[PDB]
From TrEMBL:
Function: This subunit may be involved in monitoring complementarity of crRNA and target RNA.
Pfam families, A to Z: Csm2_III-A
Record's keyword terms, sorted: Antiviral defense, RNA-binding
GO process annotations (BP): defense response to virus
Name used for this protein in its record: CRISPR system Cms protein Csm2
UniProt keyword annotation of RNA-binding present: yes
The UniProt record lists the keyword Iron: no
Gene Ontology molecular-function annotations: RNA binding
Family of this protein: Belongs to the CRISPR-associated Csm2 family.
Length: 114
């Protein structure tokens, strides 16, 4: 059983009240850019500049949620909003990478059920 699968599946009625993958591309580009910077770093303690990038990613989440109602529903039902606050708090590379895999799986299931 995949948690990201059940989350997306339980939100198909069409999907996240009219969510398409094209509405998340801005978030995907920012996540993929930070995923590469983190994956190509050494210490689990993320540098002070990277946390500032995470806070800006949080700003993008709220910006895109206000721009698209379906993205607001997607980020809320998937708990993307509370967990990014935890990724920033942990200041940890292991935790942020698990966050990216969770996000990638959600988008992958959204693209499939799209």
């Amino acid at each position: 059983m995949t948690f990201a699968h059940e989350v997306v599946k339980s939100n198909v009625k069409v999907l996240f009240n009219g969510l398409t993958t094209s509405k998340l591309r801005n978030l995907m580009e920012q996540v993929n850019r930070l995923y590469t910077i983190a994956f190509n770093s050494n210490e689990d303690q993320l540098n002070e500049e990277f946390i500032d990038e995470l806070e800006y990613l949080k700003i993008k989440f709220y910006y895109e949620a206000g721009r698209e109602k379906s993205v607001d529903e997607f980020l809320k039902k998937t708990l993307m909003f509370p967990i990014i606050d935890r990724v920033i708090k942990k200041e940890s590379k292991k935790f942020f990478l698990d966050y990216c895999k969770y996000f990638e799986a959600l988008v992958a299931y959204a693209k499939y059920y799209q």
